Ligand binder design. Sequence first.
Ligand SMILES: Cc1cc(Nc2ncc(Cl)c(N)n2)c(OC(C)C)cc1C1CCN([C@@H]2O[C@H](C(=O)O)[C@@H](O)[C@H](O)[C@H]2O)CC1
Ligand SMILES: Cc1cc(Nc2ncc(Cl)c(N)n2)c(OC(C)C)cc1C1CCN([C@@H]2O[C@H](C(=O)O)[C@@H](O)[C@H](O)[C@H]2O)CC1
Lengths: 591, 591
Amino acid sequence: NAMLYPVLTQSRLLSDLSGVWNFKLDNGKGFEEKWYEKPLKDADTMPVPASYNDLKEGTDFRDHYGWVFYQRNISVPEYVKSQRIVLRCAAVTHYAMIYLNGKLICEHKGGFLPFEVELNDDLQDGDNLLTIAVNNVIDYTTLPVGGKAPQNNPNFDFFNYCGITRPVKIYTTPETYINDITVTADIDFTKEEPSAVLNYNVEIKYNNITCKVELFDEEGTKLSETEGSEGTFEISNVRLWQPLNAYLYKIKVTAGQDVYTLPYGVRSVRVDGTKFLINEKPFYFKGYGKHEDTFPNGRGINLPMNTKDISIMKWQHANSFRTSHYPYSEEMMRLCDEEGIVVIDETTAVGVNLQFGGGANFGGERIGTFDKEHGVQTQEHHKDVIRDLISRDKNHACVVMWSIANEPDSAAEGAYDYFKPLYDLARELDPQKRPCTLVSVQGTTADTDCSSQLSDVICLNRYYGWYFGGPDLEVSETGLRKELSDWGKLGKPVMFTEYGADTVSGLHDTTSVMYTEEYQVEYYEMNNKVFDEFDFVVGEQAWNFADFATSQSLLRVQGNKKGLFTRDRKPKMVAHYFRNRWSAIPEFGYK
Amino acid sequence: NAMLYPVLTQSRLLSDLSGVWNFKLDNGKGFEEKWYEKPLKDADTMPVPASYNDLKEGTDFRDHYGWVFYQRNISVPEYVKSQRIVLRCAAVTHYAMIYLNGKLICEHKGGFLPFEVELNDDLQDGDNLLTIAVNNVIDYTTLPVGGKAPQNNPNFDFFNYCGITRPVKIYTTPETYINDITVTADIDFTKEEPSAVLNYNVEIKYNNITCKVELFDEEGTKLSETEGSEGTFEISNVRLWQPLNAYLYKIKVTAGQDVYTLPYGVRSVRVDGTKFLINEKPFYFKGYGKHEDTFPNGRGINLPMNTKDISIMKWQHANSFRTSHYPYSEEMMRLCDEEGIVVIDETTAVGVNLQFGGGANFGGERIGTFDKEHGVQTQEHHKDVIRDLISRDKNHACVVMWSIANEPDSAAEGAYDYFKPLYDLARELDPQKRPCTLVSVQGTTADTDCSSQLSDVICLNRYYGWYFGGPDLEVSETGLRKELSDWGKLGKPVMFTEYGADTVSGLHDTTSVMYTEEYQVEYYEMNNKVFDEFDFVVGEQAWNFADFATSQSLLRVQGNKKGLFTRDRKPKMVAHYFRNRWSAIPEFGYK
Ligand SMILES: Cc1cc(Nc2ncc(Cl)c(N)n2)c(OC(C)C)cc1C1CCN([C@@H]2O[C@H](C(=O)O)[C@@H](O)[C@H](O)[C@H]2O)CC1
Ligand SMILES: Cc1cc(Nc2ncc(Cl)c(N)n2)c(OC(C)C)cc1C1CCN([C@@H]2O[C@H](C(=O)O)[C@@H](O)[C@H](O)[C@H]2O)CC1
């Protein structure tokens, strides 16, 4: 349930298992021949962390269907068995099965969230045979959703990168440990010098022991102390965490023979009318929808590209993005804390719409998305994911909002009844009672979108001037203004979380045509002109930040080319257009 | 002196320090204000491992001159202070100064080789302030060499990527530990089923204790045992490590309360006449000169790209490369062991030639390279580097040769006397008495090159058809045949370690011109035609494997575009040409 980011501490170690592991593709007979017990014969090499799909040649590898086997030797000195020994998987994509010496010791469904397992019982003095098996199959029971029509069929527009996506490490704790930590903030904005009070709450598991919780500022000075599993601080004249201007207090929580620190930023999130308020000021989202996508790591974690992406944002004068379409690495989340970037944390819930791909049929009847017997089997797991996500990222001052799903069939029979339990579960599990949304596919209207009722903020993905209307930007404008005007009638805040136009870097014309850099700039001029007409529009997020990989098809020119930047982060012409527009537009008070 | 690759073992831990550190650029007043004692004020973020030059925007960052400061908190639990606690720096570029709490505890000159420091004495229960400062200045006393004409002036054709290039980890050992391990092999090739005997030799530092050394095969079976600091095995019907067909025995060396394993491949390297023999067969080098260069890591380690590079080689039917122009990561070296790739391990000794850049002058007299007062001050350090390199990579069955320097002024007054001490030091420190070379700049002839005497193999970097003769490939051919014919008269083996032609991916013509993909293919046709005429040519290595970054100048179209592949590893047309040529050409017996 609870998952704190493993770091180095006086009481806990951190042994990164990253490196070149042994690796074999399953042929079917894999589990039969109990490969997890023996070391893999005729093996292959494969770095961890990383998606495996692009690190070898040939379609047989990129396009593989099913299971892969990672192996490796691990060994701990007996002098460390005094502590409890846990194996944390930052993320395995999609389904993981972890053996040790040949004995299944764990299982996890869910390809983008961490999960751990205790090792004490199964550790065997000497070198041990660690085998993690990974499965890439997606169907109507996975999140993201795999379609219908031996090969996967992603019901989503990005490539099915699989393998050990994020790092596999080992850490330890004294057998009575800190397990969760929760921290909230009530900020008093009436004062001339605003001050605030932090509510904490530590959870443990000989659980009776002293509970020290000290508070430092970013320089390192100590400022307060308190005792108890729950407690309080009264930071006066507090330094508010702000977008593009972060401040991180530190929180050293001593308890028994265990210490853990947690950066924390003080800020307030509140909707009010047509105004998305951060620290009781009216925000405007400037930014993009992103992917964890790079060459050749695939979806694998890339701490260098994370910092380079953030550099480019601060260069472009952006302030937000959205973890389309799955939670990002803990490391990227921590970085947004230090760097001051507003994030829209979003679940793996993409592809629950079921009209894509010309749809699937049953008895000559086209299935509806939320059909009880033939449609998405994903609410059980969709709920697990809301739980794991918020348990992980609850404390991140950068997360100002939750995205329950991306482009679900939210205007359909069965939709409201699928999402209500999920929103409720989100607004009840988030200690900071943060706004909740979902990203509405093209086609929905204010009248028909089950998001008009459940959502604190309306998030549209619209393509007026690309799929709908292009190349006639004038007509497309009238379309966008008409629909946008309608959404105004809800009185809620509206933002675009996705708009864009495929552009192959290099293609130009003085009089533009689709796919050229000139057309891409003109498309954003038209859209943005209309955005600026309506004071309830509180955010623009382009799709996408950068070119990224997709399953092949006629519509996809060697991937999705809707990026403002090429896949190696080099600016298309539109990147300068946006950088100039965002420069003349503030974080606060644009309305 | 001795540096074994830190791994996970029953007796030793491995705590990778990689992550986002604190980071500030020096302004001059850095050391004055003793920033290493306090935590950095107004800091910045920076992933480690990685060059910092490309991870922020603006020339002030990319082009910075001088010092940078990395900071970070480290903390060990007192229950681990029983063992000795060492901080290993895989590589800092160029000069590192390591503080702890404010007390200089280490220093290293040398930007591409590992170096460690014991922490027990300076560790202070609690969180500690680890500050590594890094310096990028190059001049006549550094390897590589920095030129003359506040900015660096690389006397080499690649970008001055600096910062913490390879990972910083922490490992431990029992206070009497294994420190080095050496292993050689005499192979008996007379038998029908060749067998061999391995000579080992362990070094330690209560040094009196038992010495167990067990031998396993790759599957994991144990095959032998022996006791003693020195000893022997008699692997019968042995499995010879071969190029593109690796086999790795494992060697578990128990000694006191310490275990360490070391993969090892059995093979023989021997020159004989005009024939470079691996396992007493006549090899032909197929491959390229490489860089540790990727976006945006710079020179920083990239285990995903390492595996992807090796995939591409096996796709192209290559078998070798050369660590131009500095030693690569230990991880890449280990990988070549498992993958079966022949490496030419090479020192940081590039830019000792001093005729580049129009040269530097003194009293109206142009300085010669090896002038005793005004020229290269680098033999002291050049010798350290030969030592560190061979102490690190001595056991790697993939290293079949040593490159002392790249394009030194080897036909000049003073040259022979500079290199003789260095070769000798190389042929005496390498337990396997492996061939030694240096890469000869254009201009040298057999008669004039001090490499004709010192070197077991002649390695030419020639550009007939690019800088010299291009665009007239016919004339250039006559030039190449004439010079090449000459080198034949030494009776030694000759190989080209560098040839190539800048090619901007995308530029084409039916009737080619320079910089097009068609010209690049034609240039290699001409060169290779002449190579194939001479049976003493035993290797072709293209320059370069992939496009890489350089200091700016008119001659460098957004970097060095001589790659067979673009900087993101995508094939230029020549890559298919080579893949087809190398397919019809074996590892052995091409002559
Ligand atoms: C092109 C299309 C059309 C329709 N409608 C429709 N199609 C064909 C015909 Cl003949 C017809 N009459 N109508 C449509 O809705 C129907 C099918 C339910 C959906 C969408 C795409 C699905 C994915 N998106 C979002 O934008 C990104 C991108 O496309 O680049 C994705 O990468 C990203 O995940 C995603 O967030 C945009 C629309
Ligand atoms: C172009 C040149 C010319 C001369 N000679 C000369 N220049 C101008 C004039 Cl007017 C003149 N009459 N003669 C020369 O030798 C003299 C200067 C000592 C050296 C070289 C380059 C130095 C670097 N190399 C190697 O190839 C790679 C690459 O160039 O791409 C590098 O990246 C790589 O490090 C390196 O291994 C090739 C030659």
